[PDB]
């Protein structure tokens, strides 16, 4: 509360460490459905159904331009990418499986780097 603070957690490396995680997600072999924004002209249903599209390249631009106020807002966009994927793709599809694999990969790196 006013003039009463928990001890200051060192967040000075968060930007660099989120960049490294995002590099590792970018270079994963199952990243291909997620590298670029879904083409809203060419994919029927996507625009109407997925209210907040997100992809790795859009995260990378947000990261590089100081549009994440903290590491939690960064994790929210990464998870959004996988939540969108599960909303639109059957579990038993290449893209559906890709999304599950990447979410697992992400969540481990997140825990190991920060928890």
Curated annotation (Swiss-Prot):
<feature type="domain" description="Bromo">
    <location>
        <begin position="9"/>
        <end position="113"/>
    </location>
</feature>
<comment type="similarity">
    <text>Belongs to the WAL family.</text>
</comment>
<comment type="function">
    <text>Regulatory subunit of the ATP-dependent BRF-1 and BRF-5 ISWI chromatin remodeling complexes, which form ordered nucleosome arrays on chromatin and facilitate access to DNA during DNA-templated processes such as DNA replication, transcription, and repair. Both complexes regulate the spacing of nucleosomes along the chromatin and have the ability to slide mononucleosomes to the center of a DNA template. The BRF-1 ISWI chromatin remodeling complex has a lower ATP hydrolysis rate than the BRF-5 ISWI chromatin remodeling complex.</text>
</comment>
<protein>
    <recommendedName>
        <fullName>Bromodomain adjacent to zinc finger domain protein 2B</fullName>
    </recommendedName>
</protein>
<comment type="subunit">
    <text>Component of the BRF-1 ISWI chromatin remodeling complex, at least composed of SMARCA1 and BAZ2B, which regulates the spacing of histone octamers on the DNA template to facilitate access to DNA. Within the BRF-1 ISWI chromatin remodeling complex interacts with SMARCA1; the interaction is direct. Component of the BRF-5 ISWI chromatin remodeling complex, at least composed of SMARCA5/SNF2H and BAZ2B, which regulates the spacing of histone octamers on the DNA template to facilitate access to DNA.</text>
</comment>
